[PDB]
Amino acid sequence: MPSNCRRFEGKVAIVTAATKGIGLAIAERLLDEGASVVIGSRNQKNVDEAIEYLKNKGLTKVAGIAGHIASTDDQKKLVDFTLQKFGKINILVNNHGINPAFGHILEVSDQVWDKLFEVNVKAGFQMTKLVHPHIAKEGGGAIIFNASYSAYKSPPGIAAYGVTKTTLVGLTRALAMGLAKDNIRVNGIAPGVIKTKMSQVLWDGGEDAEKELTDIQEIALGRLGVPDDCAGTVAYLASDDSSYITGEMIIIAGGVQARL
Amino acid sequence: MPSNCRRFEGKVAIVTAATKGIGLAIAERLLDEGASVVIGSRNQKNVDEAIEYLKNKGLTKVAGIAGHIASTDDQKKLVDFTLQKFGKINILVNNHGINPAFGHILEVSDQVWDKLFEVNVKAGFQMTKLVHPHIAKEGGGAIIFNASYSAYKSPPGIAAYGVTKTTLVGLTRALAMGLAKDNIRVNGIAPGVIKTKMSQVLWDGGEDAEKELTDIQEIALGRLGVPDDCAGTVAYLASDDSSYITGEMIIIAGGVQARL
Amino acid sequence: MPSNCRRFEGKVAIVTAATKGIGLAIAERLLDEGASVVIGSRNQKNVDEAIEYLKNKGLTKVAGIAGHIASTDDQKKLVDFTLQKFGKINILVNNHGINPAFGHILEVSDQVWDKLFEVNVKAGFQMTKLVHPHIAKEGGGAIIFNASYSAYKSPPGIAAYGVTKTTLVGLTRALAMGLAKDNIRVNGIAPGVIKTKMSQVLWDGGEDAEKELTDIQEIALGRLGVPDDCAGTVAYLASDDSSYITGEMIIIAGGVQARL
Amino acid sequence: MPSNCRRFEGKVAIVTAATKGIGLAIAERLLDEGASVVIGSRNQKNVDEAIEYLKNKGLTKVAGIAGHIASTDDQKKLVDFTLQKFGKINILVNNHGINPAFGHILEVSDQVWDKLFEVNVKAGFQMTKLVHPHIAKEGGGAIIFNASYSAYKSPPGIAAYGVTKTTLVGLTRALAMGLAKDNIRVNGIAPGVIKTKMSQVLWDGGEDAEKELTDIQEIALGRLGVPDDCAGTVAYLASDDSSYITGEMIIIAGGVQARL
Numbered sequence A, B, C, D: 001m002p003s004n005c006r007r008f009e010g011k012v013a014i015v016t017a018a019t020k021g022i023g024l025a026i027a028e029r030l031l032d033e034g035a036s037v038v039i040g041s042r043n044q045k046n047v048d049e050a051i052e053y054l055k056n057k058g059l060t061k062v063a064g065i066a067g068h069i070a071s072t073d074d075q076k077k078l079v080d081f082t083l084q085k086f087g088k089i090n091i092l093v094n095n096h097g098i099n100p101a102f103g104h105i106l107e108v109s110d111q112v113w114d115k116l117f118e119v120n121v122k123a124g125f126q127m128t129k130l131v132h133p134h135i136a137k138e139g140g141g142a143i144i145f146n147a148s149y150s151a152y153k154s155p156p157g158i159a160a161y162g163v164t165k166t167t168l169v170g171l172t173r174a175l176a177m178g179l180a181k182d183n184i185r186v187n188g189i190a191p192g193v194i195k196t197k198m199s200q201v202l203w204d205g206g207e208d209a210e211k212e213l214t215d216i217q218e219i220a221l222g223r224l225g226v227p228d229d230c231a232g233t234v235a236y237l238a239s240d241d242s243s244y245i246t247g248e249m250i251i252i253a254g255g256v257q258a259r260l
């Protein structure tokens, strides 16, 4: 697991929705590679636990602030807290995304529809507008979006969610084209089924409910992902190892086929 | 131009935003192939002119109703008027889409962002929910979305618009997966630069402002599209000639390359 | 539904490997729309039966010539026969393709590999170079490739075959970019599982081996294709209904998802 | 930035066609991260210079063997030399690829066509079959293909070449699906214009012929690539940082848009 990579010394990153699951793994990895990192999530207790968890592993260049990521007030607070703690911003990882609905797409209300886009898409656009001048002032940097494999393969039950993630593919690209002039590279990841609280209902009926899911999902590599499976990609995308890559999505799904 | 195709005898279609440009061409073609068609747009005068234009060519199974497509009141009025005039609904063509902004994506306000999605995406989802039970009652039918080539290649100046069109790719797919159980096929078109009022600012500086655009756009076929270039595809997608095709987007851009 | 479409009066098409299945349906449809058509396949008896079958339906503007499609001698004979019979060539449908192997990709010999590419790709390139000057002389026309959905979703057992079909996506595009100057549009179809002799081993355990296959395959529309499901698309792509479309693949797979 | 990454201690890689350009940068990076590496190319003098160059930087876990990559004798010699020198094989990087033709696709002879596929595709398939049992014996590993952005965007002048690279996308995927059972991940890179001897004719009219090329090409990041721009990606794809990623292509083109 320790790569000895230290591609982030003297960089500051914000990772949204990063007190559990994929986001926390991303933050941990950036911290292992020498970054200072601000994490956030809604619940102060989750922030507290995540900060304690990281500091217990010796990763002390971390701070946390509780906030709703789709609140414009909390967005500004997150960005200002980052600047207060660490003086600058190099990287933004828009990891947040919700999935409240489960059902047929025709049963998604106009309100639930709007909420899905508000949190899953709009909030990342807003965060991007706020961090932009700060990242540009450092001569450039990176923004990463956590979309989903379901951007590409429309899933049953969470199809409206999936559509938001398709949107993030386009937003990743549009921001990439637009922020290239500031040497800000914008890329994304499109994870498959990762074992987290969000996907729990699909995989928490034993070893064999997990194997049956691996089967149905058609996962070449024959297992479900874990949060750490995303982190090496995020680190790669936010580092100089990808300095000539912008506007791309990397599918992290164990070999599930949804585009060429 | 006359194909002698009559694949739409005894079918009823709604074509939104169909008093000018691509939408009117789509309506004309469906009418040539024997459909009854309802068109709509905001301005009653545009509705009146379009109906007169079609009736002068002998295409009399047409009716029109003025309405804002993103108004829930007007959506219901459009669908109810269709049922009042023609008794059923087989096909919906969600042709509407706006593009008010021109500038950098970072300059798009939260409000303009939401408006873009409201009209370009949400309204088609809403129209789809309203027509759904009526189409299903006929044993199936078709829904077509007019997205854009800029779903795939993020353009300068209208990038937020482009993102909405990416979203429509995902929405087309999600609706396709979800409405297959009702034998409702959902597909889209992704046009390149079509000469209409919407794209006018790009191509209305003579023959050579058009040739310079053809160059920059990298259009293999060396010309800009016209509304009629979309109509044969829509007809194809809404007919039995595509009865085994659902969830697809067809790029109609004269050979511009943006996916495999 | 016989469509009444008559988009091909005065046009001549060559449809390769067109004495059974998809190719014969393509030829029949072009003939219904008023084309003159040359078909070919290896076996003179199959040629004879196909010609008899078409002439019994009153489609008499057809001729046939037996030949191996990957033989350079037979390619030249096919094109020269077409010019002798009908004087010109407007359309080429490269329908041919084989799949001798079934097994793991690692068990495909170098020889079988080369044969797959020779017939599935190279022969279409060769036919394209032979018809090219003749189609250009008519002011343009169309060339269609029959690839496969398995170009996009790598299948088990016939993966090497699948790779040849991926190649055809690229070849379709490359020829489109290259022949646009001659107003020759080059597009393709990428069918899913179509019930023919070729795909028989996948679907031939009764009507619920077919329903089990449509769940494994995740076919939204809940059924397997038939040859006629491809024909409407080919006709569309070869007609003026698609006059602004070049370089594109249309997946004809009942809603199987493999790209955006 | 030398990354301090050391993800390849105790691993052995073969990098084909790796005495200049992208391949040599790939080899150098794997060596910096602690791998043992075998390189090869046709010309013994190039092998000698590359080995001297690497050993002068202190990267001594390298060996070289001259050979033609599309020779079955030389393929076997390369794999056997690697096993003789280092005892095992964990990683294969199929970097090789040629482009002899420059002109229209219609001017590509059958012979040149076959040669393009022989070297650009078949040789990678062959190398994959030879290394396969050895990599499987280590419990898995990785195979990387160097395709090209021109797999996705068909270029003028080298279109046949481009088609071979499209094929590699398919081959990457097919091998990924097929070798997943052995925990061998197969991924690729699709570079844009990288400044090497191979691409020299496109970019070698001074520093503003380079800037003119970056506008024609629509390279968001406003510059041409260098070999080192590929290496970080290869290292990432061959390391545990991508342990849940198989079947994917990463475009490394400074933000040129060619798929979603």
Ligand SMILES: NC(=O)c1ccc[n+]([C@@H]2O[C@H](COP(=O)([O-])OP(=O)(O)OC[C@H]3O[C@@H](n4cnc5c(N)ncnc54)[C@H](OP(=O)(O)O)[C@@H]3O)[C@@H](O)[C@H]2O)c1
Residues within 6 Å of the ligand: A016, A017, A018, A019, A020, A021, A022, A023, A040, A041, A042, A043, A044, A046, A047, A067, A068, A069, A070, A095, A096, A097, A098, A119, A146, A147, A148, A149, A190, A191, A192, A193, A194, A195, A196, A197, A198, A199
């Ligand atoms: N798990 C998967 O299978 C999967 C697959 C593809 C993509 N993704 C994407 O991965 C991302 C993270 O998901 P995950 O699976 O890691 O979920 P998770 O483990 O349940 O983590 C959710 C995190 O987001 C925070 N959060 C929830 N709502 C929030 C809000 N409104 N404002 C700020 N923070 C909020 C949570 O903390 P609080 O409760 O303290 O707010 C927690 O830190 C999402 O974008 C999701 O769509 C997940």
Ligand SMILES: NC(=O)c1ccc[n+]([C@@H]2O[C@H](COP(=O)([O-])OP(=O)(O)OC[C@H]3O[C@@H](n4cnc5c(N)ncnc54)[C@H](OP(=O)(O)O)[C@@H]3O)[C@@H](O)[C@H]2O)c1
Residues within 6 Å of the ligand: B016, B017, B018, B019, B020, B021, B022, B023, B040, B041, B042, B043, B044, B046, B047, B067, B068, B069, B070, B095, B096, B097, B098, B119, B146, B147, B148, B149, B190, B191, B192, B193, B194, B195, B196, B197, B198, B199
């Ligand atoms: N032209 C292009 O280059 C191009 C390229 C790709 C995609 N498209 C898409 O094609 C679609 C139609 O565009 P077009 O180029 O044909 O535009 P156009 O010729 O300017 O036509 C616009 C039509 O939409 C109506 N409309 C505008 N706002 C409306 C609203 N809020 N509610 C209902 N109707 C409304 C207009 O009538 P009123 O003024 O009476 O409302 C008119 O009938 C859009 O989805 C657009 O994004 C266009």
Ligand SMILES: NC(=O)c1ccc[n+]([C@@H]2O[C@H](COP(=O)([O-])OP(=O)(O)OC[C@H]3O[C@@H](n4cnc5c(N)ncnc54)[C@H](OP(=O)(O)O)[C@@H]3O)[C@@H](O)[C@H]2O)c1
Residues within 6 Å of the ligand: C016, C017, C018, C019, C020, C021, C022, C023, C040, C041, C042, C043, C044, C046, C047, C067, C068, C069, C070, C095, C096, C097, C098, C119, C146, C147, C148, C149, C190, C191, C192, C193, C194, C195, C196, C197, C198, C199
């Ligand atoms: N069936 C499917 O599920 C499916 C799915 C996707 C794509 N496709 C594609 O559809 C195309 C047609 O296949 P199909 O399923 O229609 O097969 P089919 O019904 O078995 O017919 C194959 C046709 O090709 C002819 N043929 C075979 N080898 C030939 C050769 N070497 N030279 C000239 N003609 C030859 C056969 O006639 P002779 O025996 O007389 O030569 C016959 O007319 C192929 O490109 C295939 O890859 C099929």
Ligand SMILES: NC(=O)c1ccc[n+]([C@@H]2O[C@H](COP(=O)([O-])OP(=O)(O)OC[C@H]3O[C@@H](n4cnc5c(N)ncnc54)[C@H](OP(=O)(O)O)[C@@H]3O)[C@@H](O)[C@H]2O)c1
Residues within 6 Å of the ligand: D016, D017, D018, D019, D020, D021, D022, D023, D040, D041, D042, D043, D044, D046, D047, D067, D068, D069, D070, D095, D096, D097, D098, D119, D146, D147, D148, D149, D190, D191, D192, D193, D194, D195, D196, D197, D198, D199
């Ligand atoms: N440069 C670009 O813009 C670009 C863009 C996209 C993809 N690529 C891909 O990058 C890969 C490497 O190309 P490059 O640009 O790095 O080229 P390069 O700097 O010119 O180097 C080519 C290398 O291949 C070796 N080689 C050539 N033919 C060979 C053969 N038949 N057998 C074994 N080795 C051989 C050469 O050595 P000898 O002369 O000693 O054989 C040399 O080490 C290719 O797959 C190419 O298609 C390049």
